[PDB]
């Protein structure tokens, strides 16, 4: 099941596109939630970790898009290079990423707008609607998010495309608002909010069930910081639009990686500054559940600034929302045309010259997801899928670096005399990659499920941990000794035997940091995808 397919914007334009597609909905809404529940004032470190992993992923994309001339989503590159099943998994994960990102950003947009106008829509929803599933479904069904998704799907079906000028304007407004937030945090905020103790564990409001934690800079510990990093990984998603951009690029394979990295660095700087401001102006446990940044501004007396923020957020979210919506029908259409998904989804309509059916179906799914589930649950469900997709791309890069160009003894495996990759070396690298992926999954399982056991130093946990880590190093060395393909690439991952492996490890660890419900939702989604592939994908594949 590995059939393989037969295959101007400047750097600044790509940077602007990535920044516009990444900044919103992760800093304006989820930053406060992470700083209150998962990370505390140490959320600054979380954004760092989520940044680094993201950068690694981006670097993989730089190579992963360099191996294929036709610019497109990671699904296209996988289906061209590695095969059909792998590409289907990657495309299905990207579909989940786009759908749940649309749902979550629509939730954030609806919540922000409703809060701005005094939360009348929330009162209406609570009055006339109730899901009666508090443990899984959302307390308040976001009807306005559904309306937003319906309107935007209607616009997309009619042929509305990426307006670069409007994106640039909104990104400039967003960046100005973020700079204002950082400056106001460093002016009004104080370091004492990072040094809170039991004396200050008293919010001036009358909130109940407050989590005060240890206090200080890291109230919830490094486990909390890691959970916050896993949640904040959602904030760095969106740079894919750089590589998948429809418009022709002046220097595609050279500008795409630099643009992705620069966008990620700018987003990391913005997130660090804004989160430090948010946690310095207001105590982490005092952060408002609904409007963290406006709540912090009101706490320090600059309540009027809530309007300015209300502007920037509503800009950023918009630029993020479309950033999640435009790719959403494209990947589905690409997969349906290739036969992996139902062929009817590939029917471009003559009235509009757009994939009407795919757009409508994806929009309806996103609207339902936004109607039924909370913002945090959607964020985690998108993060797990995006992490899996990035790990898949990193594994593709690692494997393909050692495969021979398209047409035994222990010493031979350890020391391959061949100057260039032979099919034996390619098979060795494939086996090593599979073993390393399984072993990294085992390491993360022991490091999370057995985290307390490792802290307790039980014999079995330590034995498995040391064995798995040493064998991971051994397999990485096995891959290292294999010759790399001499096929010249415009962009390459610097340390191909280590960097992709580290990217996979960090990604899988972050996925392990996610909750059980997120894993159950991801498992049922993957079951649906596998059912579709094995029942329809294999037999109706276009390349069959």
């Amino acid at each position: 099941m590995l059939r393989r397919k037969v295959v101007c914007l400047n750097t600044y334009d790509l940077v602007a596109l990535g920044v516009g597609s990444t900044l919103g909905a992760g800093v304006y809404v989820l930053a406060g939630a992470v700083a209150r529940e998962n990370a505390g004032p140490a959320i600054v470190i979380s954004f760092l970790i989520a940044a680094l992993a993201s950068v690694l992923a981006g670097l993989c994309y730089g190579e992963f898009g360099a191996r294929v001339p036709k610019t497109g989503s990671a699904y296209l590159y996988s289906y061209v290079t590695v095969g059909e099943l792998w590409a289907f998994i990657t495309g299905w994960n990207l579909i989940l990423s786009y759908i749940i990102g649309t749902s979550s950003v629509a939730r954030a947009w609806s919540a922000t707008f409703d809060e701005l106008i005094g939360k009348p829509i929330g009162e209406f929803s609570r009055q006339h609607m109730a899901l009666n599933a508090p443990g899984v479904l959302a307390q308040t069904p976001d009807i306005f998010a559904v309306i937003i998704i319906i309107i935007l799907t209607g616009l997309l079906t009619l042929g509305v495309k990426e307006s670069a000028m409007v994106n640039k304007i909104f990104t400039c407004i967003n960046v100005l608002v973020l700079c204002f937030i950082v400056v106001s945090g460093f002016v009004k905020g104080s370091i004492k909010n990072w040094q809170l103790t039991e004396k200050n564990f008293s919010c001036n409001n009358n909130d109940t069930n407050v989590k005060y934690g240890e206090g200080g800079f890291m109230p919830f510990g490094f486990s909390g910081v890691l959970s916050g990093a896993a949640t904040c990984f959602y904030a760095f998603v969106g740079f894919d639009c750089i590589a998948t951009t429809g418009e022709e690029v002046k220097n595609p394979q050279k500008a795409i990686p630099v643009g992705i990295v620069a966008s990620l660095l700018i987003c990391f700087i913005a997130y660090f500054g804004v989160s430090a401001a948010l946690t310095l102006m207001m105590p982490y446990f005092c952060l408002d559940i609904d409007s963290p940044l406006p709540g912090a501004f009101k706490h320090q007396g600059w309540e009027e600034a809530k309007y300015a923020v209300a502007i920037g957020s509503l800009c950023a979210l918009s630029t993020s929302l479309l950033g999640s919506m435009f790719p959403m029908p494209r990947v589905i259409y690409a997969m349906a045309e290739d036969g992996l998904l139902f062929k009817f989804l590939a029917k471009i309509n003559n009235r509009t010259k757009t994939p009407v059916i795919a757009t409508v179906t994806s929009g309806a799914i996103a609207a339902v997801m936004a109607f039924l589930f909370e913002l945090k649950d959607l964020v985690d469900l998108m993060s797990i899928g995006t992490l899996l997709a990035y790990s898949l791309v990193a594994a593709c890069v690692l494997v393909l670096r050692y495969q021979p160009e398209q047409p035994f003894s222990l010493k031979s495996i350890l020391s391959p005399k061949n100057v260039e990759p032979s099919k034996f070396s390619g098979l060795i690298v494939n086996i090593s990659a599979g073993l390393l992926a399984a072993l990294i999954i085992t390491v993360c399982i022991v490091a999370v499920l057995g985290r307390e056991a490792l802290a307790e130093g039980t014999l079995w946990a330590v034995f498995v941990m040391t064995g798995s880590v040493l064998l991971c190093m051994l397999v990485t060395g096995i891959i290292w000794r294999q010759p790399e393909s001499k096929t010249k690439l415009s962009f390459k991952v610097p340390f191909v035997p280590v960097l992709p492996v580290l990217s996979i490890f960090v990604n899988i660890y972050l996925m392990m940091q996610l909750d059980q419900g997120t894993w159950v939702r991801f498992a049922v989604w993957m079951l649906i995808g596998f059912t579709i592939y094995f029942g329809y994908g294999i037999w109706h594949s276009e390349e069959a």
């Binding site: 103790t197 039991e198 409001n205 909130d207 407050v210 934690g213 240890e214």
Partner: protein, 223 residues
């Protein structure tokens, strides 16, 4: 003759943090001293979080709204959330729950080493900076898996309450780590309690193994 005897338990600063009184003949009343592990830390080492708390001060930290008093504005839900990420100390109710867990876990606990009253042969155990526990084998009592004991140390220290008994006391925002200190025979024959004796109690955990210094002494007056 009968005196109004009083047994005083003090922090490392020699300030009385707990006491029990009764009319008894001298050197004939040896009650089980039940000072809370946190009172010993009042004005003690910075780790316990009571370095600025005077003796007999009320337990700090907001109340758990799992507590008997019920949900109130500003409650801490940490007392319900997992204690894995917390530090064992006394500055908050949930930190006190974590301290109780550490003090009751079989793989963890606390150990107590003697101070100046130890024999000169034990002088290698170090001074107060080491809590008299510079090396293993210096500990004479306390609750750990290897159950240290001494035939010459004056006291034995255990936990007065089980985890189930102490959890709800912690959730009530009360002092909820009561030690149980029983005079050994050697302590009973000894009569230098007027000058006071001192011990160092250290948590047996992974890392710092933070500890404090406490002391026991006797007072008496005609009555």
């Amino acid at each position: 003759q009968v005196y109004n005897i009083t047994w005083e338990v003090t922090n490392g600063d020699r300030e009385t943090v707990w006491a029990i009184s009764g009319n008894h003949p001298l050197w004939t009343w040896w009650p089980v001293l039940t000072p809370d592990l946190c009172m010993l830390a009042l004005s003690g080492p910075p780790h316990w979080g009571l370095e600025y708390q005077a003796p007999y001060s009320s337990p700090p930290g907001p109340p758990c709204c799992s507590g008997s008093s019920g949900s109130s504005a500003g409650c801490s839900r940490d007392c319900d959330e997992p204690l894995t990420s917390l530090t064992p100390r006394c500055n908050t109710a949930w930190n006190r729950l974590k301290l109780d867990q550490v003090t009751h876990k079989s793989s963890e606990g606390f150990y107590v080493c003697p101070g100046s009253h130890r024999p000169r042969e034990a002088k290698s155990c170090g001074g107060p900076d080491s809590f008299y526990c510079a090396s293993w084998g210096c500990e004479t009592t306390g609750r750990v898996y290897w159950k240290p004991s001494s035939s010459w140390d004056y006291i034995t220290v255990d936990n007065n309450l089980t985890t189930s008994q102490a959890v709800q006391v912690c959730k009530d925002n009360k002092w909820c780590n009561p030690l149980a200190i029983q005079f050994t025979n050697a302590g009973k024959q000894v009569t230098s309690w007027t000058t006071g004796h001192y011990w160092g109690l250290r948590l047996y955990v992974s890392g710092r193994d933070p500890g404090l210094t406490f002391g026991i002494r006797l007072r008496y007056q005609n009555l």
